[PDB]
Amino acid sequence: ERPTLPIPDLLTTDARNRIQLTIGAGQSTFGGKTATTWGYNGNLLGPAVKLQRGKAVTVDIYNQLTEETTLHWHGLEVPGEVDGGPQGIIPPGGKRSVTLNVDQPAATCWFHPHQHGKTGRQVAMGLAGLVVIEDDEILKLMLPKQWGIDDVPVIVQDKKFSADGQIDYQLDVMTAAVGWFGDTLLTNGAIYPQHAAPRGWLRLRLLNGCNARSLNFATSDNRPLYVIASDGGLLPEPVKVSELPVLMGERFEVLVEVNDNKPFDLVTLPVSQMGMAIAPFDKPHPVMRIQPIAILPDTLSSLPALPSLEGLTVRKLQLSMDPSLDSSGSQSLSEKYGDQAMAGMDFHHANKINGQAFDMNKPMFAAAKGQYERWVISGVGDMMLHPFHIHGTQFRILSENGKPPAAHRAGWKDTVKVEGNVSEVLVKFNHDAPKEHAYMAHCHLLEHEDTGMMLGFTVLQGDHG
Ligand SMILES: [Cu+2]
Ligand SMILES: [Cu+2]
Ligand SMILES: [Cu+2]
Ligand SMILES: [Cu+2]
């Protein structure tokens, strides 16, 4: 009765060293009702692009939509020219080719659009995919590795639908304040699927692909999750947890034990974020059912020491929301949903960094290349959750929202929590990003990003003094 977990195709290079991605409109079915949806190589979501460290691939991207889009590789340490930020326009009916020279450790990354002012809508319509980066090191570890059997991607997303079955997306005053969220949870595009897994260890590559909703994964029968990797790759050793908070755009890979004759659910637990604890999410909600079919590593990798903080450039990034949006938006939330919404209290340019709404034509600063910087990101004076994402890098978190990072969050990350307090990350950019293809740094609550909470930055030379 439960549908099976859809498994994205694991896509590798052809004999020409090319991967073809087609962006296009189609249809999907949710709870019996048809909806217009968009996908990469299909109707919804996308494949998993498989990349090998030290090898180049060329991706041909065909935009068969009737509007512009871009294709950003979230978590990839590549040059601005192929980063697919807002300046990476792919015309409707057109094609753009990018060569990815992969040079970072094994990791589960992802890809999605980054079209200026419309990223939230384009993701909500269905556009997201995965990146599986492998290297020599990870293959020696004997992790579960049968793609779609015991090594399974799990993209978790909410949507809401109107009466006619169609996806009901709006960038309005309420969503620009608290984000777009819905009442229906999807798992690789399916509602509450089941996955058949071999007895032993199941590897789940978890992605929060929601526009705005934070998630908190756990198991129905309280069996633990062993986190083996974060956004940017393997942790030094497994970290046992009973629950796992995952912000929008973050990935974690976990190992969970599968025992004969004991089905259980992966679930998501209620979170404190405004709007996100409305029914059906006021209680633990199922994500998928694991069905055992009657068919743990000590050390995973090495995590280098944090470099000395002395003499590193510090960049301050002050996040803000115009008081007018903050009160009107929160008022709309509370009036519609009431106390359950838990409101802890022109909009197109009302969300800001350092007093400025995103300017695509004027990068705010030029970072140094090949040098560690200390970026201090503040949400002081605003109660909203901002998962802050910096392009072109995998960084280390020094401080996360006023505390040292939890052990499973102390490795390689591209996202950091900012909520009412201040975070500090240690970041290095190995590749060029010029003014014409700048790197983005932004809140990954997509409606904030789309209404100004993003900056462009360049990377070019730095160390000549
Ligand atoms: Cu990104
Ligand atoms: Cu706010
Ligand atoms: Cu935000
Ligand atoms: Cu480079």
From Swiss-Prot:
Keyword Ubl conjugation tagged: no
InterPro entries in UniProt: Cu-oxidase-like_N, Cu-oxidase_2nd, Cu-oxidase_C, Cu-oxidase_fam, Cu_oxidase_Cu_BS, Cupredoxin, TAT_signal
Cofactor: how bound: Binds 4 Cu cations per monomer. Contains a mononuclear type 1 (T1) or 'blue' copper site, and a trinuclear copper center consisting of one type 2 (T2) or 'normal' copper site, and two type 3 (T3) or 'binuclear' copper sites.
Binding residues annotated for Cu cation 4, in chain numbering: 386, 443, 448
Effect of mutating residue 384 to L: Strong decrease in oxidase activity with 2,6-DMP as substrate. Affects copper incorporation into the T1 copper site
List of residues binding Cu cation 1: 72, 389
Catalytic activity: 4 Cu(+) + O2 + 4 H(+) = 4 Cu(2+) + 2 H2O
One GO molecular-function entry: ferroxidase activity
pH dependence: Optimum pH is 6.5 with 2,6-DMP as substrate. The pH dependence of the reaction as monitored by oxygen consumption shows a broad activity peak between pH 5 and 6 and a second activity peak at pH 8.
Top-level EC class as recorded in UniProt: oxidoreductase
Activity regulation, short description: Ferroxidase and phenoloxidase activities are enhanced considerably in the presence of excess copper ions. A labile regulatory copper ion near the T1 copper site is important for the copper associated activation of enzyme activity. Ag(+) acts as a potent inhibitor of oxidase activity by binding at Cu(+) binding sites, blocking Cu(+) substrate binding and oxidation. pPD oxidase activity is strongly inhibited by sodium azide, an inhibitor of the electron transfer.
Enzyme Commission identifier(s): 1.16.3.4
Any one of the GO CC terms: periplasmic space
Cofactor: Cu cation
Domain Plastocyanin-like: 26-136, 198-263, 346-459
UniProtKB keywords: Copper, Metal-binding, Oxidoreductase, Periplasm, Repeat, Signal
Biophysicochemical property: temperature dependence: Optimum temperature is 55 degrees Celsius with 2,6-DMP as substrate.
GO BP terms in the entry: detoxification of copper ion; response to copper ion
Subcellular location as annotated: Periplasm
Binding locations of Cu cation 3: 114, 391, 442
Biotechnology: Triggering CueO activity at need by the addition of copper salts with minor toxic effects on E.coli cells could be used as a simple tool for biosynthetic purposes. The protein was also identified as robust host protein for use in biosensing and drug-screening applications.
Family assignment from sequence similarity: Belongs to the multicopper oxidase family.
PANTHER family: BILIRUBIN OXIDASE (PTHR48267:SF1), CUPREDOXIN SUPERFAMILY PROTEIN (PTHR48267)
Domain comment in the entry: Contains a methionine-rich region, which includes a helix that covers the entrance to the type 1 (T1) copper site and blocks access to the T1 site in the absence of excess copper. This methionine-rich insert is involved in the binding and oxidation of Cu(+). It also binds additional copper ions, which are important for the copper-associated regulation of activity. The methionine-rich region provides at least three additional Cu(+) binding sites: Cu5 (sCu), Cu6 and Cu7, which play related but distinct roles in CueO oxidase activities.
Assembly information from the UniProt record: Monomer.
Record-given protein name: Multicopper oxidase CueO
Organism, scientific name: Escherichia coli (strain K12)
